[PDB]
Symmetry: C4
């Protein structure tokens, strides 16, 4: 019925697994700033929402490969979460 | 009928409340640049539209949590505002 | 019929008028880098497509107001241009 | 049937051809950082997904023209790849 929660679960899984694997892939490259889990979790949100401020980004092969998975899986899931919120909002747009 | 104004109202509420709570959450962290309301209002627009230049961004736990609300609520509402503008434009695309 | 060209015309108008008014609004503020028309035209593309690298952005009240018009009018028109390209691509996706 | 692979092929072609032509267009301008193929390939992903961190961007006329092609062709194709992933996910959203 409300599979929007299932897409929300998949989004949180991508945000958590992405931030965990990013720190795992970035530690080892001199100059890398995506090397601590707390700020790496907000980087996953920056990538999945496509906002991308640029304060945090990968600079390694794997780290950028992890970002690709966060892009493909996160933007799709976040697009499904924000689409359900759009449908619900219209459902009251006529109950004026 | 034209609930596009209702989504526009929700967008302005998210832009204003987001910029107000961001300054409230960022003041206190040394090095924070999102600490004045006027430029924080344009940061809300940068986030809601997903453009994200990167000249302004939060660096605190709460400030980033405020950004998440601006992302979830702002991108959904701005997506509804820009979708209604798209529909209206097509309505004249055949009145050539 | 192919109103996609009409949305393409509106996009070019927003890109040109936006880059012209941005330079007009940014010149006068010390430190502004969006002050020449050639690179301001690519800034309009960065904003309308929502990519937003961050190498160029407004720092004035009007300049940021011009960016809002480029966001509202440009993302809507570019969304219509890229949607027609998507429909056309599917039209051959079954002429295998 | 599953033309999603065809849009995926077009995306990879735009990512590869875009990163190849970007290095070809950027080498020659002092200060250009998009001058090696490996990191230019991730720049194509940053542009096509619209994330745009800002660590890499063109600064030449042609290089920015190449970016426009990566924007028009890449965002359209990546939008088709992520839309098929969204449809497939809903197909199991009711096989609970
Ligand atoms: C014409 C061909 C265009 C593309 C060629 C790409 C070749 C890949 C070879 C990888 C070697 C690593 C180079 C190196 O030692 O540098 C690493 C450390 O700086 C950075 O790694 C990287 O550059 C990351 C690779 C790009 C990410 C891939 C995006 C996936 C869609
Ligand atoms: C494997 C687990 C991966 C994720 C773990 C996250 C743990 C959160 C603990 C918070 C402690 C704060 C750390 C600190 O003192 O630093 C703050 C000041 O720099 C920055 O705050 C932050 O890092 C903000 C947290 C991330 C934003 C959350 C995004 C919501 C979707
Ligand atoms: C609680 C209220 C939150 C929002 C309050 C906003 C008040 C606006 C007053 C403008 C005074 C200019 C300040 C200044 O001298 O500085 C300018 C030069 O740095 C920068 O201009 C600016 O900050 C631009 C304003 C923000 C852009 C508006 C985005 C439209 C959606
Ligand atoms: C009112 C008119 C507004 C727009 C005018 C644009 C005129 C173009 C003339 C090009 C001359 C190059 C200037 C130069 O020597 O500088 C190059 C090296 O820095 C940078 O090239 C550039 O500025 C790139 C041009 C902008 C990209 C085009 C985006 C396409 C949608
Ligand atoms: C360099 C350490 C490799 C860690 C990569 C984790 C798995 C990445 C999958 O994209
Ligand atoms: C550190 C001050 C906390 C201010 C947070 C305001 C409410 C945030 C809701 O996301
Ligand atoms: C400071 C000079 C003002 C120029 C503004 C041009 C019109 C902007 C419309 O948003
Ligand atoms: C300055 C070298 C020109 C290279 C341009 C390659 C083709 C670009 C097509 O947009
Ligand atoms: K920077
Ligand atoms: K974006
Ligand atoms: K988008
Ligand atoms: K930046
Ligand atoms: K962006
Ligand atoms: K950026």
């Amino acid at each position: 019925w409300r599979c929007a929660g299932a897409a929300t679960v998949l989004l949180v899984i991508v945000l958590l697994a992405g931030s965990y694997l990013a720190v795992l892939a970035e530690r080892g490259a001199p100059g890398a700033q995506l090397i601590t889990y707390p700020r790496a979790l907000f980087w996953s949100v920056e990538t999945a929402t496509t906002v991308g401020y640029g304060d945090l980004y990968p600079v390694t092969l794997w780290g950028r490969l992890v970002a690709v998975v966060v892009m493909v899986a996160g933007i799709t899931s976040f697009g499904l979460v924000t689409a359900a919120l759009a449908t619900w909002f219209v459902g009251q747009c006529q109950q004026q």
